[PDB]
Amino acid sequence: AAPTAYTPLDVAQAYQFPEGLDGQGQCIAIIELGGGYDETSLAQYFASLGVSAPQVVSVSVDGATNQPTGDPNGPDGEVELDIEVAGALAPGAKIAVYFAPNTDAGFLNAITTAVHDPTHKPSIVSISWGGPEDSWAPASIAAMNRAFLDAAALGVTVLAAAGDSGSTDGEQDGLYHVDFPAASPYVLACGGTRLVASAGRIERETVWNDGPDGGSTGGGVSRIFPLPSWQERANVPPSANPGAGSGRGVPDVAGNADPATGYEVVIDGETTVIGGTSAVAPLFAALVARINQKLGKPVGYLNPTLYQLPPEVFHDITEGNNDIANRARIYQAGPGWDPCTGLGSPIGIRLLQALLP
Numbered sequence: 001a002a003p004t005a006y007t008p009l010d011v012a013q014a015y016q017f018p019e020g021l022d023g024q025g026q027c028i029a030i031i032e033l034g035g036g037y038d039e040t041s042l043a044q045y046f047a048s049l050g051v052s053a054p055q056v057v058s059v060s061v062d063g064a065t066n067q068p069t070g071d072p073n074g075p076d077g078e079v080e081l082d083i084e085v086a087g088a089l090a091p092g093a094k095i096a097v098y099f100a101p102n103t104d105a106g107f108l109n110a111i112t113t114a115v116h117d118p119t120h121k122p123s124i125v126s127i128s129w130g131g132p133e134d135s136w137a138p139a140s141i142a143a144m145n146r147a148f149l150d151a152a153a154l155g156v157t158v159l160a161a162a163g164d165s166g167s168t169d170g171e172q173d174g175l176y177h178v179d180f181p182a183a184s185p186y187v188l189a190c191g192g193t194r195l196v197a198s199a200g201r202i203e204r205e206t207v208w209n210d211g212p213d214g215g216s217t218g219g220g221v222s223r224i225f226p227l228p229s230w231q232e233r234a235n236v237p238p239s240a241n242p243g244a245g246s247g248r249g250v251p252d253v254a255g256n257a258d259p260a261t262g263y264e265v266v267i268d269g270e271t272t273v274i275g276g277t278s279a280v281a282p283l284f285a286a287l288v289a290r291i292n293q294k295l296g297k298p299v300g301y302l303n304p305t306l307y308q309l310p311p312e313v314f315h316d317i318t319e320g321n322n323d324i325a326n327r328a329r330i331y332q333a334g335p336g337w338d339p340c341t342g343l344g345s346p347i348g349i350r351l352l353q354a355l356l357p
């Protein structure tokens with residue numbers, strides 16, 4: 001195969017994003033635990049995309065500030081990527097990037113800060129950081145979970161990439177682990193795929209899996225969180241780990257993440273190509289920004305509503321697995337919800353259609 005790339009507008013096109021909407025009146029908050037973002041690269045990208053640059057603002061949490069390392073191959077990548085994909089698709093909204101110490105408490109304080117932020121009042125929050133759910137301090141996970149719940153009951157969407165290491169989520173204990181915050185049931189977990197689409201159609205789209213060296217979408221069965229009531233007709237399989245057990249399946253939806261069909265971005269002055277699920281939360285954060293707009297109200301927590309929406313609102317991914325550890329093929333995709341791509345990739349238009357009164 002040959003590695004390609006899209007700009008953020010092309011992929012939106014692919015997924016039939018509702019046109020004529022930009023996020024105006026809306027405000028997206030993006031969580032960042034390191035690195036920074038340089039204004040030269042941003043303006044260059046927003047012009048290069050023939051889009052009017054959206055307002056970007058930094059918010060210091062527990063000390064942390066906007067601290068770019070100049071290395072396009074380091075944190076900055078993640079910080080600029082998030083703002084570039086998000087800002088290019090919903091240029092109308094207002095970006096509010098929140099930086100915090102990379103600690104269990106900085107991550108938490110950052111979320112609660114944005115979530116209840118009275119000055120920027122974001123309606124959506126995008127997270128592209130995380131970690132095995134079984135590696136976080138239990139008190140941490142419960143704290144954050146509630147932070148999300150508090151978020152829901154506040155009319156605020158919370159999206160988060162599902163990882164970049166497949167079903168094993170980068171752990172060699174020989175078991176399967178899913179990623180947090182993605183496992184939190186109050187989070188719309190974003191998985192990743194390898195999309196092959198053009199202005200008028202998605203030629204193909206499979207689970208994103210480039211082996212051990214290339215990365216693969218995180219996904220599977222939570223071992224911490226029970227099976228949501230709204231996810232009970234999704235046929236989440238039980239864990240593949242010996243002992244089995246029900247669990248909140250991951251992810252909820254998926255979007256392009258395969259670097260080999262990555263995003264074309266501008267990091268620290270360098271024009272390169274980034275991938276991974278980190279691109280998907282902001283990808284869909286912009287989606288929700290336009291939908292909130294047309295509606296004139298925050299769709300807040302979308303998970304319950306999504307799981308019972310009809311088939312034509314989602315493209316179903318059926319080929320592929322996100323197992324980069326063995327030949328067992330766990331987890332494997334198939335018709336309808338699966339532990340690789342969840343409900344599949346959304347079709348914005350049909351999704352806004354589905355949500356209006």
Ligand SMILES: [Ca+2]
Nearest residue numbers: 317334335336
């Ligand atoms: Ca499927």
